[PDB]
């Protein structure tokens, strides 16, 4: 996200988002500083394991699918998906990885569909009882559990490069007052005077 005008206080006052909590910096004291680039990712996991999307923690999705760097000052936003994602008959388009070679690095995307070796034998295409397909689907049913109910989780991150800033608050303004001695403020000037 670049050259944008973004509002952040409407998310706290939306009154429909279950997890309005993250680390780094509060969104109330966030709009007073200017930022140059906004990142956004979208993924779907089930209910009760939404806690381990944070650096320095273990898990299955955290260690093998998606993780965060140690100096992560961004925010995480999640909400329920009872209507759109969950239906009758199941949805086999939502899958999560199981197998990879080593510990994950932050911020990379893997579409490696090649089956992961476990023993010393070669895999060679067809499943050789150890070289497994690392993707497993989800069984979506409207009478699932609380921890098995799918959630729509969106993470965001902020940075500060040498590029010029894009979004500051945009911090709004006040009304216009004329013919009175006021402290006028503008885009790049401050001073005291009367406006006519």
């Amino acid at each position, epitope marked *: 996200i670049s050259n944008c005008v973004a509002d952040y206080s409407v998310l706290y006052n939306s009154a429909s988002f279950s997890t309005f909590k993250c680390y780094g910096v509060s969104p109330t004291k966030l709009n007073d500083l200017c930022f140059t680039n906004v990142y956004a990712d979208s993924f779907v996991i089930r209910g009760d394991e939404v806690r381990q999307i944070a650096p320095g923690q273990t898990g299955k999705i955290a260690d093998y699918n998606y993780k965060l760097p140690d100096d992560f000052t961004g925010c995480v936003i999640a909400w329920n998906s009872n209507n759109l994602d969950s239906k009758v008959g199941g949805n086999y388009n939502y899958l999560y990885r199981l197998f990879r070679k080593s510990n994950l690095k932050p911020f990379e995307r893997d579409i490696s569909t090649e089956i992961y070796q476990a023993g010393s034998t070669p895999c060679n295409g067809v499943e050789g*009882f*150890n070289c497994y397909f690392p993707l497993q689907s989800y069984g979506f049913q409207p009478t699932n559990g609380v921890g098995y109910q799918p959630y729509r989780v969106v993470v965001l991150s902020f940075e500060l490069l040498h590029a010029p800033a894009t979004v500051c608050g945009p911090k709004k303004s006040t009304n216009l007052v004329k013919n009175k001695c006021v402290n006028f403020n503008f885009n790049g000037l401050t001073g005291t005077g009367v406006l006519t």
Partner: antibody, heavy 120, light 107 residues
Framework: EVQLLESGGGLVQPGGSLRLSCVASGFTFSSYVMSWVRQAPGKGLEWVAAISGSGGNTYYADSVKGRFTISRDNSKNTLYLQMNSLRAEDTAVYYC?????????????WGQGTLVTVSS | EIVLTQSPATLSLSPGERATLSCRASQSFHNYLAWYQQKPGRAPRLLIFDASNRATGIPARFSGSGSGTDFTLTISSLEPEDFAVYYCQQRFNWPLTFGGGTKVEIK
């Protein structure tokens, strides 16, 4: 399946062979891949054999270089047992069991099994 | 190939103070472990179905903990079924050597 047919035992002298079976009926062989383990009175447990649920690859154990012969058929979904040159190591209990519907382990419920006794 | 070490055999003590199991295996794992309960004269059955999670038919008296190289439990309540033998089992590494368990000496 919630139940399993109870197998039998044998009192074969050393140097002979054993032929028993533990076969259920009306059960899908593709799911709940079979596994055989020895309940040793002593050292512990070790897996024996595991064949593909649709008929295919099977694996020999580390201590079994083809000594415990695995000749199983998928048309009748045969669950059997055959070996040669019987030894004093076979003084244990044979268990017929199966793990979850996936190939990797996800929970295995076991049977009562029958003990086999070696005496020369 | 894969070594399962099952305790230094010094935990055979009184069943008080909620003694745990020190099954150690310092090698590569995918946190896919299952545990078994055996009484003499009785065929063993499963305890957990994926990892640290009770299956159907057992209450929350057993709750696993640990990943990667170490795994343990916290027992909740004393019971006549606590005077029995626990087993440690792993699911990968298809040669599939298993644990040995340990004894409990009541004091």
């Amino acid at each position: 399946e919630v139940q399993l047919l109870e197998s039998g035992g044998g009192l074969v002298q050393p140097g002979g062979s054993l032929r028993l079976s533990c076969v259920a009926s009306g059960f899908t062989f593709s799911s709940y891949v079979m596994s055989w383990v020895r309940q040793a009175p002593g050292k512990g447990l070790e897996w024996v054999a595991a064949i593909s649920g649709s008929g295919g690859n099977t694996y020999y154990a580390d201590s079994v270089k083809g000594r415990f012969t695995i000749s199983r058929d998928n048309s009748k979904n045969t669950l059997y047992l055959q070996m040669n040159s019987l030894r004093a190591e076979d003084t244990a209990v044979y268990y017929c069991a199966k793990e979850g519907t996936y190939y990797y382990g996800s929970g295995s419920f076991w049977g009562q099994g029958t003990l086999v006794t070696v005496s020369s | 190939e894969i070594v399962l070490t099952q305790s230094p055999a010094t935990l055979s003590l009184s069943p008080g103070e909620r003694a745990t199991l020190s099954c150690r295996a310092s090698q590569s794992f995918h946190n896919y472990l299952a545990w078994y309960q055996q009484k003499p004269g009785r065929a063993p059955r499963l305890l957990i179905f994926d990892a640290s999670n009770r299956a159907t038919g057992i209450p929350a008296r057993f709750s696993g903990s640990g990943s990667g190289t170490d795994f343990t439990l916290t027992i909740s309540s004393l019971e006549p079924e606590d005077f029995a033998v626990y087993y440690c089992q792993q699911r990968f590494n298809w040669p599939l050597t298993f644990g040995g368990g340990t004894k409990v000496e009541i004091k």
